[model samples]
Target chain A: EVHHQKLVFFAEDVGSNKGAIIGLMVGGVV
Target chain B: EVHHQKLVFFAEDVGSNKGAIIGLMVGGVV
Candidate 1:
């Protein structure tokens, strides 16, 4: 069987040139 | 002023019912 997933990579300037990142890879596929 | 930026994080996963996670994190201020 196959599965599908979505992800939203977000980055925001917290302050003083700071940053953030996110991941939502299939994580799993059973 | 508002500075716009872009960042990318990706994963390709390896076999054997196992997985991996990576991309990095933060800690800063002005």
Candidate 2:
């Protein structure tokens, strides 16, 4: 059976003059 | 002036058998 879940992520900026950096990946129990 | 921004991230789930992998970093303009 496949389960559905809600995913959420958050990030903050300090003294960066560029853009936002973020990465996300999903993995199961190996 | 310092700018305040709202950051958000998202992720999904697959068939891996490990866990959720996430990475986040901040860099400035060099």
Candidate 3:
């Protein structure tokens, strides 16, 4: 079975929505 | 496959809790 993916997006730390944008882009590709 | 709700944590760019603290203390073991 494939395990569910867990993402930890830190938008506050990475400045604005940088973390979230990066996560979404990465998630979309993977 | 199930996709649960997503969470985004962003601590203010100031203060002690700054940045995403990873480790057992923050519920993230590593």
Candidate 4:
């Protein structure tokens, strides 16, 4: 839960395309 | 709809290790 606590992302944060990018990046190796 | 129809991924598709890797790469641009 602690990891989840710090985890956050916004579409505006990286842009829809970029967000999805890193989202999938972070999505991996988790 | 057709794109969605063909789109599919399994952990073994490329493996979560790789899927999430490529998913992020694919995620980035798409």
**Interface DockQ of candidate 2:** 0.07
lDDT of 2 at B12: 42
- For model 2, what is the alpha-carbon lDDT of residue A5? 39
On a 0 to 100 scale, what is the lDDT of residue A16 in model 2? 34
lDDT of 3 by residue, B1-30 (tens): 554434455543542332333321123221
User: Model 1 over residues A1-30: C-alpha lDDT tens digits?
Assistant: 333333344432223321223343433222
Query: lDDT values of the candidates?
Result: 0.34, 0.39, 0.37, 0.28
In angstroms, the error of model 2 at B15 is 3.7
* Model 3: residues with Cα > 4 Å off, grouped in runs: A1-3, A11-30, B15-30
* Model 4 pairs whose backbones collide: none
Quote the positional error of residue A26 for candidate 2 in Å: 19
Model 4 chain B scores worst on lDDT over the 10 consecutive residues at: B1-10
Residues A1-30 of candidate 2 have per-residue lDDT tens digits of 343333345433332333333474444341
DockQ, per model, reads 0.04, 0.07, 0.12, 0.06
- Tens digits of per-residue lDDT, candidate 4, B1-30, equal 222212233322312232222343333222
Ranking by lDDT: 2, 3, 1, 4
lDDT of 1 at A28: 25
| Candidate 3 local lDDT, residue A26 | 33
Better of 3 and 4 by lDDT: 3
3 or 4, greater by TM-score: 3
TM-score of each: 0.26, 0.25, 0.24, 0.18
Among the numbered candidates, top DockQ falls to 3
lDDT of 4 by residue, A1-30 (tens): 223212343332312222222333333232
